[model samples]
Target: SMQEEDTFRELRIFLRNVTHRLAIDKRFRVFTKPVDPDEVPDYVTVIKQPMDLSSVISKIDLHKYLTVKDYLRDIDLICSNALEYNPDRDPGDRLIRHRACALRDTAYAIIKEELDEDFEQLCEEIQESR
Candidate 1:
């Protein structure tokens, strides 16, 4: 039981580290909060699954992720949703699209360079026949 609990803690710590890196970037500020459907009524319809940095933070604390990849996927979704909604050809909102691209790139860079490779091994331990 202790092993299970400790494994969960490690995952949470890993997620927090990723979140911290993303949060400090000024480009990601706009995505800190969820897009308001009331402000843009079509947001929910266009973006099937809405995600934001705030949601990721909340999910990490709430222990909503069962695996490292699950957490990472949500972070990626936030960017893809933004890019899908704010195409480069769209008028006035081009910067939002650009920020989304930058955030996604930076997110992966942090994962590859700064995140612990041990986390992946831990995840395998959880899933494998041990």
Candidate 2:
């Protein structure tokens, strides 16, 4: 069990690093609309030319991006990984759960910090949106 916990802890650290990197990258933007939950059909949407964040950020007006409220929806979706773990299970289960929890927490923290709000308000807003 201890080993499992340790492994999960490491996973958490890795996830934190990833979140940190993503949060500081100025070019990336979150998408606000929720995709249909049942639309899991196997398919891929292709674009002829992908927009580059670096190019877009340099030329596009920031005002065109989603509003903070809309952006919060995107953050909520990214952070939902935190709600998926259950640490009380067996060691194998715990390890997986811990990894998910760690990643989720990292994402949630980054979004919360960006929003500049306490956790309570963040939760309230997310709940209201849902």
Candidate 3:
């Protein structure tokens, strides 16, 4: 469905935002890789203004402490809402599919190790491939 396309588009926005922070703020990492301020994508060169993580994360539910299901459920909401809110936005199918391939790995990356295997596995299985 087009939701997958929209979800991937939203995910790409977040990914770009992450890289923006990494490059200018040096505050985060992708696979723990540092971003280069000298680097530039087609869209950005000089940030002019550095955004707070609070803004980027605001798209999803976070802030106060919550249950395991609560957090994971928020992620699920993010996965679907990214598409629902903007149903017509679509970059490309291959891009969508590739983003999906990494969905499991990225979601699992932030999850605590104590959550248990089945739970993480479940998030990993959320996307059944393109």
Q: Rate the local accuracy (lDDT) of all candidates.
A: 0.82, 0.38, 0.37
lDDT of 1 by residue, 55-121 (tens): 8989999988757778878878988898888776765468888788888888788778865668676
Better by lDDT, candidate 2 or 1 = 1
Give a tens-digit lDDT track for model 3, residues 24-123: 4322222122224454242123222332224335533332212234334443433343233223546653443334334433554544443455543443
Candidate 2 stretches greater than 4 Å from native: 1-88, 116-130
Pick by lDDT: which candidate is best? 1
Q: How do these models rank on lDDT, best leading?
A: 1, 2, 3
Q: Tell me the tens digit of each residue's lDDT in model 2 across 8-63.
A: 34433433444446545432222112223354132113222222223223222332
Lowest lDDT sum, 10 consecutive residues, model 1, at 121-130
lDDT of 2: 0.38
Candidate 1 TM-score to native: 0.85
- Per-residue lDDT, model 2, residue 6, is 47
Name the 10 consecutive residues with the lowest summed lDDT in model 2: 40-49
